Write a protein that binds this ligand. Structure first.
Ligand SMILES: C/C(=C\[C@H](C)CCCCC(=O)O)[C@@H]1O[C@@H]2C=C[C@@H]1OC(=O)\C=C/C=C\C=C\[C@H]1O[C@@H]3C[C@H]1O[C@@H](/C=C/C[C@H]1O[C@H](C[C@H](O)[C@H]1C)[C@@H](O)[C@@H](O)/C=C/CC/C=C/C2)[C@@H]3C
Lengths: 49, 159, 50
């Protein structure tokens, strides 16, 4: 499965990124979910996308 | 059987903790889905309490199992033919099997090996991963720390 | 994921093991640079940016 994307803050502000030639990014976080049909499970992590 | 707080050992993902029992349902039957989180990958597992023995969950091991794995250690007598690919396949099948005594047998075999000649990179990563999950099991069985269990190993690794 | 759903063994895998984010991050980085629609901001007066 795939559900609930949520963001963090940006890792570095605007002028510092424009100075040090880094991009102006922010991380994604998505709660994945793996379900086994035969025996019954969920496996819920917080996958860094 | 199960209560809140039992550090019950999941087979492959090491030892885990329980939080509660979810009475969620499929087809109207509210099964006892025990919510069982681990500390390794921060993943939470919900498992129905009926087929917990079918999936092979297991309670924590005691002093008799500690003496049994110490008996499996400190006994250096083994034979495997020199075609190391067969040895690699055998211990990988072991590692997918998931038994504490066999895990101890393979980490003592690889300690005997790298103590003697030297290992490959994948061999060293194999020994490190199996040794780390054995350290986690022994620490959560003896209710103590990683460095304590590693010193316990280093004094029982054929010392 | 559909490939390694079968080749992996069951009762051992997890969404941390199943997921490879590198084609997604390569698609994003291949869009923002080296595309037609992603161009430099034409700034020599504030009308030109607008
Ligand atoms: C031909 C073309 C863009 C040309 C390079 C510029 C526009 C040509 C029209 C004109 O002569 O005015 C098409 O552009 C896009 C996709 C296909 C085509 O790209 C193409 O096939 C050609 C290039 C596509 C991407 C290039 C990316 C990088 O190459 C350098 C850095 C990056 O971008 C280029 C700069 C683009 C900004 C231009 O801006 C123009 C003025 C200058 O020509 C440039 C400052 C201004 O007219 C500006 O206000 C208008 C931009 C057009 C908006 C985009 C339309 C579709 C610079 C040369």
């Amino acid at each position: 499965s795939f559900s609930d994307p949520r963001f963090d803050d940006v890792k570095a502000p605007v002028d510092e990124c424009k100075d040090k030639d880094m991009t102006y990014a922010a991380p994604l976080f998505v709660t994945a979910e793996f379900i086994n049909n035969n025996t019954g499970e969920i496996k819920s992590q917080t996958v860094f996308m | 059987i199960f209560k809140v707080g039992d550090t019950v050992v999941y087979p492959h993902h090491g030892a885990a903790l329980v939080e509660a029992i979810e009475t969620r349902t499929i087809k109207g039957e509210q099964k006892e889905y025990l919510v069982l989180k681990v500390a390794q990958g921060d993943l939470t597992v919900r498992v129905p309490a009926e087929n917990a023995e079918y999936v092979g969950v297991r309670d924590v091991v005691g002093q008799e199992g500690l003496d049994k794995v110490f008996q499996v250690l400190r006994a250096p007598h083994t034979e495997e033919p020199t075609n190391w690919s067969r040895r690699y396949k055998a211990n990988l099948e072991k590692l997918a099997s998931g038994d504490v005594n066999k895990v101890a047998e393979v980490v003592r075999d690889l300690w005997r090996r790298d103590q003697e000649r030297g290992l490959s990179a994948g061999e060293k990563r194999m020994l490190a991963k199996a040794r780390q999950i054995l350290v986690g099991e022994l620490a959560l069985a003896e209710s103590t720390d990683d460095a304590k269990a590693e010193t316990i190993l280093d004094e029982v690794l054929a010392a | 994921v559909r490939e390694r759903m079968t080749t992996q063994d069951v009762e051992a895998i997890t969404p941390q093991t199943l997921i490879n984010i590198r084609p997604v991050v390569a698609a994003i980085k291949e869009f923002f640079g080296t595309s037609q629609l992603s161009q430099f901001m034409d700034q020599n007066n504030p009308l030109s940016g607008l």
